[PDB]
Amino acid sequence: LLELDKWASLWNWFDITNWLWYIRIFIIIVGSLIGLRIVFAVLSLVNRVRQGYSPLSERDRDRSIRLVNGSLALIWDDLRSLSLFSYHRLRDLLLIVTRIVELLGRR
Amino acid sequence: LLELDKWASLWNWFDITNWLWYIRIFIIIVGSLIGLRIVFAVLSLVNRVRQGYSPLSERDRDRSIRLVNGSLALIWDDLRSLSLFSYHRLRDLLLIVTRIVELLGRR
């Protein structure tokens, strides 16, 4: 039950040892799919429009297809609002941004 | 420290050995745990309608709840946009989506 002679015996099997050992590398590989999941957030945006946002329980699909290219515009939605054309403007936006929280702070 | 006698001796514990010798299978189970999140994406859809569209700080509650069952319909939402009725028509839809780049590429 577990020993130097036992571990070294696995290399002679050339069958179970692959699964038994490759599992260690497989652990890190498993961790990989989780990071993959963040793209789904992008998929939900496409999914919302592509099939229908409100409870679906189909002509709008032709128009929904623009969301394909929408990946580019989507990143721009956040960037164009903060700075708008020039980046120096972002600094200006940064000051008002702090000012807006003060206004909404008290209902 | 650590040997045939040490590993076998641990069996006398009858408590730690279970958690220590079952985590290995549990590692693969973690992979199952993360794949569970994929269904969670439907929850966001429910949450978006059930939260009141844009954060606003309602009959929609009764209808939004049945989105519970709507999860079944949600999988169908994608199937209905892509194929429509039969699983043959979808071959054509696959073509128009790729074709859309051509239509949207001009001008």
Added chain:
Amino acid sequence: LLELDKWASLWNWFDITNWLWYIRIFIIIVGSLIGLRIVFAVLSLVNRVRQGYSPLSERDRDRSIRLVNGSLALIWDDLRSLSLFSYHRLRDLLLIVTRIVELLGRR
């Protein structure tokens, strides 16, 4: 080759042993890592209003920054309608969700 004197030899390295022996705890941490991703669903809701939803290929952003504080309100849409201040009221929701199935059934 795995042995009493072999395992204890790793501590002398004071380098690889940390990475080699800390991955085991890290596997459990990965479990924490996958659950971390769920908050992104919350971010997506924020993003929906903040960047837009329908294929978006100056006045709009000042209002959207209101959503900054809106994060607090965002969690309240679900909590207030679902439970309504006290938990005793949540029991009403508990019964309402079951009966609600009867209503969407016919549609």
